[PDB]
CSV table of N, CA and C in Angstrom, one decimal:
chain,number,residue,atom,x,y,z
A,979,UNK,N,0.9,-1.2,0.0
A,979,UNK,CA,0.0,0.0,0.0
A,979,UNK,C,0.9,1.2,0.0
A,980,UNK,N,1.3,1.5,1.0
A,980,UNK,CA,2.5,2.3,0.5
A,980,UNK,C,2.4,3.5,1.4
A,981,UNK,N,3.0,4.5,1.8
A,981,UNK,CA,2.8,6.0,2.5
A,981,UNK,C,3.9,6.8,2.3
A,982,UNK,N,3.7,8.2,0.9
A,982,UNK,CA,4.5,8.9,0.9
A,982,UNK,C,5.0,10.0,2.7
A,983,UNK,N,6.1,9.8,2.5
A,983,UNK,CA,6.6,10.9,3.8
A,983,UNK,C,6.3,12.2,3.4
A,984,UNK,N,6.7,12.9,4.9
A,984,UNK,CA,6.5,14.4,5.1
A,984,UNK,C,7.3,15.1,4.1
A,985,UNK,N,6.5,16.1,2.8
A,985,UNK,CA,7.4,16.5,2.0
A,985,UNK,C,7.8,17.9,2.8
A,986,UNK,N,9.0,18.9,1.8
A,986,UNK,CA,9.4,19.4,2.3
A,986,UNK,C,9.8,20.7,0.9
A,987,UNK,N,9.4,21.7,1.0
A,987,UNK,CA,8.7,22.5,0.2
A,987,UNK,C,9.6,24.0,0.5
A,988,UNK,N,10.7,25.0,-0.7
A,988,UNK,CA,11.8,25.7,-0.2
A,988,UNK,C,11.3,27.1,-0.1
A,989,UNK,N,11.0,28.1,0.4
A,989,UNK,CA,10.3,29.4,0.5
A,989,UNK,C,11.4,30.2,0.5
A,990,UNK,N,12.3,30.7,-0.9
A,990,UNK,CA,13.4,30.8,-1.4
A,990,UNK,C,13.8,31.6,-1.0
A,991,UNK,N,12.4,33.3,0.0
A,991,UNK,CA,12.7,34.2,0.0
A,991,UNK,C,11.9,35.0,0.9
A,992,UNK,N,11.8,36.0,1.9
A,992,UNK,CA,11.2,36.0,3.2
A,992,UNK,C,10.8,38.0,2.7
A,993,UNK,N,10.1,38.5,3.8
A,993,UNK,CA,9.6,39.8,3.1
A,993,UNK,C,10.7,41.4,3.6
A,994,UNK,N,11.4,41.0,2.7
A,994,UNK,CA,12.7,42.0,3.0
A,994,UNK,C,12.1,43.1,2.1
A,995,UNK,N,11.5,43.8,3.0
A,995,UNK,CA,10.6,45.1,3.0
A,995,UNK,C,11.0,46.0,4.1
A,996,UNK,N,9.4,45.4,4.6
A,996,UNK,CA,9.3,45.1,5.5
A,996,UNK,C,9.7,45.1,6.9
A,997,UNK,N,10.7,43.4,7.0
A,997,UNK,CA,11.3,43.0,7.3
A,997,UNK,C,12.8,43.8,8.1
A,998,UNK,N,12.3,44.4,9.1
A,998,UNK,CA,13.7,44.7,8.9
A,998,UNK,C,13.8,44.6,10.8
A,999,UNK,N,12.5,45.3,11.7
A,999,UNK,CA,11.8,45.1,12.9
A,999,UNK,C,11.5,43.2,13.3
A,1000,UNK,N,11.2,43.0,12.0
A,1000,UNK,CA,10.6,41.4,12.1
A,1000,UNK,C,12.1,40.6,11.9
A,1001,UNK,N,13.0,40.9,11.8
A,1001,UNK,CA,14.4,40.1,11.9
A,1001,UNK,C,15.0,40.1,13.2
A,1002,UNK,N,14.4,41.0,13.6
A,1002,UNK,CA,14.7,41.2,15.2
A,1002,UNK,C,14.1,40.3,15.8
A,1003,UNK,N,12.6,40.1,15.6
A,1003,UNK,CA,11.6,39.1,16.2
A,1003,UNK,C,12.0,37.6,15.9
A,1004,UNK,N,12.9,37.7,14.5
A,1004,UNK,CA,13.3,36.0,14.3
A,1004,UNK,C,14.3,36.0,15.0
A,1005,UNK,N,15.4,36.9,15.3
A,1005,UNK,CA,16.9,36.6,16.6
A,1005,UNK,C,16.0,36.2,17.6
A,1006,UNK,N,14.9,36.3,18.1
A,1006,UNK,CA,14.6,36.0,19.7
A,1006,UNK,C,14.0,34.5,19.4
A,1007,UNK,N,13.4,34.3,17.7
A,1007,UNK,CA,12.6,32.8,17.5
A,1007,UNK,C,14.0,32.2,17.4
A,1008,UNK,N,14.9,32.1,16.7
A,1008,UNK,CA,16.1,31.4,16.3
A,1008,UNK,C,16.6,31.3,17.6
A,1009,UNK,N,17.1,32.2,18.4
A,1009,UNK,CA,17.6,32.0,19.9
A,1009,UNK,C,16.8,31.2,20.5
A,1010,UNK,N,15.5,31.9,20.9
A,1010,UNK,CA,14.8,30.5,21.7
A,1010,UNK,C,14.0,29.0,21.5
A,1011,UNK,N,14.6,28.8,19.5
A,1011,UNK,CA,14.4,27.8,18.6
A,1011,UNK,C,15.8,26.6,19.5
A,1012,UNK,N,16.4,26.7,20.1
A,1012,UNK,CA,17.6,26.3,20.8
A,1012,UNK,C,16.8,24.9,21.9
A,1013,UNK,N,15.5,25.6,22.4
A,1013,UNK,CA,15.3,24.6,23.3
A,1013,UNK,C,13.7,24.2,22.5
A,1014,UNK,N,13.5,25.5,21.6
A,1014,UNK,CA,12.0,24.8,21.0
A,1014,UNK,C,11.0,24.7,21.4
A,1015,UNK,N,11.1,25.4,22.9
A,1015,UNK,CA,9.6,25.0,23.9
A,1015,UNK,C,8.3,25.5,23.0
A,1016,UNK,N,7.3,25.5,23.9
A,1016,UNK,CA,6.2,26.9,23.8
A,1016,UNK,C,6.4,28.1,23.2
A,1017,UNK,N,6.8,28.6,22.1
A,1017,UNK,CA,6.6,29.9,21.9
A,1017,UNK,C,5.0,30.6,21.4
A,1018,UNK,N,5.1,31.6,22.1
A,1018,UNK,CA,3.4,31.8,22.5
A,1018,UNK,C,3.4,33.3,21.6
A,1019,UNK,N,3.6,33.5,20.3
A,1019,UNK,CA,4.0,34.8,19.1
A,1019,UNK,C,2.3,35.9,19.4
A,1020,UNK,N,2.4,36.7,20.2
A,1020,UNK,CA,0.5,37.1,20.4
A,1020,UNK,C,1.2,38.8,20.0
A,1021,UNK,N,0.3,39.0,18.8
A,1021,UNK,CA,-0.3,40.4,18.5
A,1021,UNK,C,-1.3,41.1,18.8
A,1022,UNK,N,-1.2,42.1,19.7
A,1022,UNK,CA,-2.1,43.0,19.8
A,1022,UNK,C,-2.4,44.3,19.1
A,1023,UNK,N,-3.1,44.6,18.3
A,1023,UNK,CA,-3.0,45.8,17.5
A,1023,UNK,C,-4.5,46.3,17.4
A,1024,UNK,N,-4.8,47.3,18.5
A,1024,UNK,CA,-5.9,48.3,18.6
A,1024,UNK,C,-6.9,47.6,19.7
A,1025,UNK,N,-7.7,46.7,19.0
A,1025,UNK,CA,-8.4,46.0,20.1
A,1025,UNK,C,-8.6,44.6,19.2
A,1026,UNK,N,-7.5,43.8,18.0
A,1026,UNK,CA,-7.7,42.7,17.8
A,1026,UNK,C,-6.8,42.2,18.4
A,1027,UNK,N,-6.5,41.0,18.6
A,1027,UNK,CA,-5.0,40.3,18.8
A,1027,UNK,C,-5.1,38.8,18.1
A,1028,UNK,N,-3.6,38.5,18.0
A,1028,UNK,CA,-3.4,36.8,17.2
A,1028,UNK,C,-2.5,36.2,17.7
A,1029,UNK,N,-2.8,35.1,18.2
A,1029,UNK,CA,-2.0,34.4,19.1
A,1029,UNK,C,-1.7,33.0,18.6
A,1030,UNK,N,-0.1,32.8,18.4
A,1030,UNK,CA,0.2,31.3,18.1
A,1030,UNK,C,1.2,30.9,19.0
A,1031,UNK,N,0.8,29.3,19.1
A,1031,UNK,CA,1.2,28.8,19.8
A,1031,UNK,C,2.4,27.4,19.1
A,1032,UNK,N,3.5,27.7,18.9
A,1032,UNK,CA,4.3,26.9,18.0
A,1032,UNK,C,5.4,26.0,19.1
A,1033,UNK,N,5.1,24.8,18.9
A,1033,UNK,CA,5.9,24.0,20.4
A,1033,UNK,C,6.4,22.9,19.5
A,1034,UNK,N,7.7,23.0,19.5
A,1034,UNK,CA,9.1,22.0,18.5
A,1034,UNK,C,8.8,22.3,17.3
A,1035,UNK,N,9.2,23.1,16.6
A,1035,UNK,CA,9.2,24.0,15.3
A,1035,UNK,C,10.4,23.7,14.9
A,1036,UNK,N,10.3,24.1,13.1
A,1036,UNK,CA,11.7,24.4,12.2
A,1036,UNK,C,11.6,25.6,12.1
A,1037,UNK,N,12.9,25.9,11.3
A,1037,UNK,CA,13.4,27.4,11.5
A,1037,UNK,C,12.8,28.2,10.4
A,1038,UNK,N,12.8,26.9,9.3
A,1038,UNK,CA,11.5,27.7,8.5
A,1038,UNK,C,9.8,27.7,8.6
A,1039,UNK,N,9.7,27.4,9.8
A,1039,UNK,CA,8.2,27.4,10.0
A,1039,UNK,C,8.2,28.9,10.6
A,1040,UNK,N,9.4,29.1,11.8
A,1040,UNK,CA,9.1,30.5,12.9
A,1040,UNK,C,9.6,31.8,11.7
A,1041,UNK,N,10.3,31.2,10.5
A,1041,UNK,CA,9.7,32.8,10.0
A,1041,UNK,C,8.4,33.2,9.2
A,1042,UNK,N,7.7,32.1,9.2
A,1042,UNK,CA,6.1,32.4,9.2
A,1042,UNK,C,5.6,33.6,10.0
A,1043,UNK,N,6.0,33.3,11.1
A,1043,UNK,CA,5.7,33.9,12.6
A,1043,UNK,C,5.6,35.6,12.4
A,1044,UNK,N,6.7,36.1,11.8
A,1044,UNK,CA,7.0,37.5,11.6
A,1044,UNK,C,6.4,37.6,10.3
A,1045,UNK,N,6.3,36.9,9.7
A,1045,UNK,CA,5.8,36.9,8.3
A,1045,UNK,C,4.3,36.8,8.3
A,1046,UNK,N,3.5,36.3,9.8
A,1046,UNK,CA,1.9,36.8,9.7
A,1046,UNK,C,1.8,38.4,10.2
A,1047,UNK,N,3.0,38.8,11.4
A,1047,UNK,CA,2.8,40.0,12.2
A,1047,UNK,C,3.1,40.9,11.0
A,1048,UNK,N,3.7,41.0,10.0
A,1048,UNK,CA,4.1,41.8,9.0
A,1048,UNK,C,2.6,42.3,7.9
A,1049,UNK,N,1.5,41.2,8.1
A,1049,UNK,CA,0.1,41.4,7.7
A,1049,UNK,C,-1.0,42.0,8.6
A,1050,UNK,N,-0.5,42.1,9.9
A,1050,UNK,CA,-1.0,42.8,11.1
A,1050,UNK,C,-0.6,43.8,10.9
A,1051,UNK,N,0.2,44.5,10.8
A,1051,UNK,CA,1.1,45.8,10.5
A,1051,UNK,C,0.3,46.8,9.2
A,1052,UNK,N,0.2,45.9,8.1
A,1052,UNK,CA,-0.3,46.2,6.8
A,1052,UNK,C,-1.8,47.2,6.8
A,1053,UNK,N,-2.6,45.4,7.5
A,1053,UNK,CA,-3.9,45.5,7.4
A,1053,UNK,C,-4.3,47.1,8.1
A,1054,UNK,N,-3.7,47.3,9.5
A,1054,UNK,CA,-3.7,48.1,10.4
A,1054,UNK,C,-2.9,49.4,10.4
A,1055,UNK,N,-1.6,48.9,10.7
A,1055,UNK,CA,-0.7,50.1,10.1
A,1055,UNK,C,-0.6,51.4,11.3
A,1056,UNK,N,-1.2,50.8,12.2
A,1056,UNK,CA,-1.4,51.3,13.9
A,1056,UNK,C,-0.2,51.6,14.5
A,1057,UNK,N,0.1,52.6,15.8
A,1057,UNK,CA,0.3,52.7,16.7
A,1057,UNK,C,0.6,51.9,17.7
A,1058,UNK,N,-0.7,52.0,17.8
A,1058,UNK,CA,-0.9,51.1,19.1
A,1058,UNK,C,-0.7,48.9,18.9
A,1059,UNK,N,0.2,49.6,18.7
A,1059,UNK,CA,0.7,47.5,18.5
A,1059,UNK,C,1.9,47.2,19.7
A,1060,UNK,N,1.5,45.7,19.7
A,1060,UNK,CA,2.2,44.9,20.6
A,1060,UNK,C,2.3,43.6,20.2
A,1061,UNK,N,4.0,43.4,19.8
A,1061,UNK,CA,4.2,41.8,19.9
A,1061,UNK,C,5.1,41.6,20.9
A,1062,UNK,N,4.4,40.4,21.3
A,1062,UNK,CA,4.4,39.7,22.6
A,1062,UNK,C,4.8,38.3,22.7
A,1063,UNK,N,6.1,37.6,22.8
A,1063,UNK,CA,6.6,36.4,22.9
A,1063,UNK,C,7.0,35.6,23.9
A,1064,UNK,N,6.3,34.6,23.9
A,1064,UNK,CA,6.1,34.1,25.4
A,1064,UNK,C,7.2,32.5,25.0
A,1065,UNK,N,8.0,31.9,26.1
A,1065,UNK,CA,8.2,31.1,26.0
A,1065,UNK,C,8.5,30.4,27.0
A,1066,UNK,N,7.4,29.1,27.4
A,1066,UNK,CA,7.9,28.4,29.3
A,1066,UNK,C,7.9,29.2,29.9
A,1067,UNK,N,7.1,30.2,30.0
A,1067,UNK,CA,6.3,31.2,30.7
A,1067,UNK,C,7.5,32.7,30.7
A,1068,UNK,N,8.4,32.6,30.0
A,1068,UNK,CA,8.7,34.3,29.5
A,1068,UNK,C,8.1,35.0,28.9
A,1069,UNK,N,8.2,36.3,29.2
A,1069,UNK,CA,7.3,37.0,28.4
A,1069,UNK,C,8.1,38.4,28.0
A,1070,UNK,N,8.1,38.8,26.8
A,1070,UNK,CA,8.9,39.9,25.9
A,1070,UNK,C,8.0,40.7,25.1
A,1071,UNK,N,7.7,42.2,25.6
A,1071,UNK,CA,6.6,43.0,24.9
A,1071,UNK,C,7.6,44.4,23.9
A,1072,UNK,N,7.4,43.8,22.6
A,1072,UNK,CA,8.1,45.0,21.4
A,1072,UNK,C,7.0,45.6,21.2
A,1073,UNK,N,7.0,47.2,21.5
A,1073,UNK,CA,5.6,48.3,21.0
A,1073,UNK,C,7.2,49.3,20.6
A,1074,UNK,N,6.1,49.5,19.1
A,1074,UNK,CA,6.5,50.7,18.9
A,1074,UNK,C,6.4,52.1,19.6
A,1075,UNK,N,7.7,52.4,20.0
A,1075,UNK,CA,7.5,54.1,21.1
A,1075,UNK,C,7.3,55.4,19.7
Protein backbone atom coordinates (compact mmCIF):
# COMPACT_ATOMS: atom_id res chain seq x y z
CA UNK A 1 0.00 0.00 0.00
CA UNK A 2 2.55 2.34 0.55
CA UNK A 3 2.83 5.97 2.52
CA UNK A 4 4.50 8.86 0.95
CA UNK A 5 6.65 10.86 3.80
CA UNK A 6 6.46 14.37 5.09
CA UNK A 7 7.41 16.50 2.03
CA UNK A 8 9.36 19.45 2.30
CA UNK A 9 8.74 22.46 0.19
CA UNK A 10 11.83 25.69 -0.22
CA UNK A 11 10.33 29.40 0.49
CA UNK A 12 13.42 30.82 -1.40
CA UNK A 13 12.69 34.21 -0.04
CA UNK A 14 11.20 36.01 3.19
CA UNK A 15 9.57 39.77 3.10
CA UNK A 16 12.68 42.03 3.03
CA UNK A 17 10.56 45.10 2.98
CA UNK A 18 9.33 45.08 5.53
CA UNK A 19 11.35 43.04 7.32
CA UNK A 20 13.71 44.68 8.89
CA UNK A 21 11.77 45.08 12.91
CA UNK A 22 10.62 41.40 12.13
CA UNK A 23 14.38 40.06 11.95
CA UNK A 24 14.74 41.21 15.24
CA UNK A 25 11.63 39.07 16.20
CA UNK A 26 13.31 36.02 14.34
CA UNK A 27 16.87 36.65 16.59
CA UNK A 28 14.63 35.95 19.74
CA UNK A 29 12.58 32.79 17.55
CA UNK A 30 16.06 31.42 16.33
CA UNK A 31 17.61 31.99 19.90
CA UNK A 32 14.76 30.46 21.75
CA UNK A 33 14.37 27.81 18.62
CA UNK A 34 17.60 26.30 20.82
CA UNK A 35 15.26 24.55 23.34
CA UNK A 36 11.97 24.85 21.05
CA UNK A 37 9.56 24.99 23.85
CA UNK A 38 6.19 26.93 23.76
CA UNK A 39 6.57 29.92 21.86
CA UNK A 40 3.36 31.79 22.45
CA UNK A 41 3.96 34.75 19.05
CA UNK A 42 0.52 37.07 20.37
CA UNK A 43 -0.27 40.39 18.51
CA UNK A 44 -2.05 43.04 19.76
CA UNK A 45 -3.03 45.75 17.52
CA UNK A 46 -5.86 48.30 18.56
CA UNK A 47 -8.41 45.96 20.12
CA UNK A 48 -7.65 42.70 17.79
CA UNK A 49 -5.02 40.28 18.81
CA UNK A 50 -3.40 36.80 17.23
CA UNK A 51 -2.01 34.38 19.08
CA UNK A 52 0.19 31.30 18.09
CA UNK A 53 1.23 28.77 19.84
CA UNK A 54 4.26 26.89 18.05
CA UNK A 55 5.93 24.03 20.44
CA UNK A 56 9.06 21.95 18.51
CA UNK A 57 9.25 23.98 15.26
CA UNK A 58 11.65 24.36 12.15
CA UNK A 59 13.39 27.45 11.48
CA UNK A 60 11.53 27.72 8.52
CA UNK A 61 8.22 27.38 10.00
CA UNK A 62 9.07 30.53 12.86
CA UNK A 63 9.65 32.78 10.03
CA UNK A 64 6.14 32.41 9.19
CA UNK A 65 5.70 33.93 12.64
CA UNK A 66 7.00 37.49 11.64
CA UNK A 67 5.81 36.95 8.30
CA UNK A 68 1.86 36.78 9.71
CA UNK A 69 2.81 40.05 12.20
CA UNK A 70 4.06 41.79 9.01
CA UNK A 71 0.07 41.37 7.65
CA UNK A 72 -0.97 42.76 11.15
CA UNK A 73 1.12 45.78 10.48
CA UNK A 74 -0.32 46.20 6.81
CA UNK A 75 -3.88 45.54 7.38
CA UNK A 76 -3.70 48.12 10.40
CA UNK A 77 -0.70 50.06 10.13
CA UNK A 78 -1.42 51.30 13.86
CA UNK A 79 0.32 52.72 16.72
CA UNK A 80 -0.93 51.11 19.11
CA UNK A 81 0.71 47.55 18.46
CA UNK A 82 2.23 44.90 20.55
CA UNK A 83 4.22 41.77 19.85
CA UNK A 84 4.38 39.72 22.59
CA UNK A 85 6.58 36.43 22.93
CA UNK A 86 6.10 34.13 25.43
CA UNK A 87 8.25 31.06 26.04
CA UNK A 88 7.91 28.37 29.30
CA UNK A 89 6.27 31.19 30.71
CA UNK A 90 8.72 34.28 29.54
CA UNK A 91 7.30 36.95 28.45
CA UNK A 92 8.90 39.89 25.86
CA UNK A 93 6.65 42.99 24.92
CA UNK A 94 8.08 44.98 21.35
CA UNK A 95 5.58 48.28 21.02
CA UNK A 96 6.47 50.67 18.87
CA UNK A 97 7.55 54.06 21.15
Amino acid sequence: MGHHHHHHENLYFQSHMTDELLERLRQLFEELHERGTEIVVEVHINGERDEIRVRNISKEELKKLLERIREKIEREGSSEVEVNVHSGGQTWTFNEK
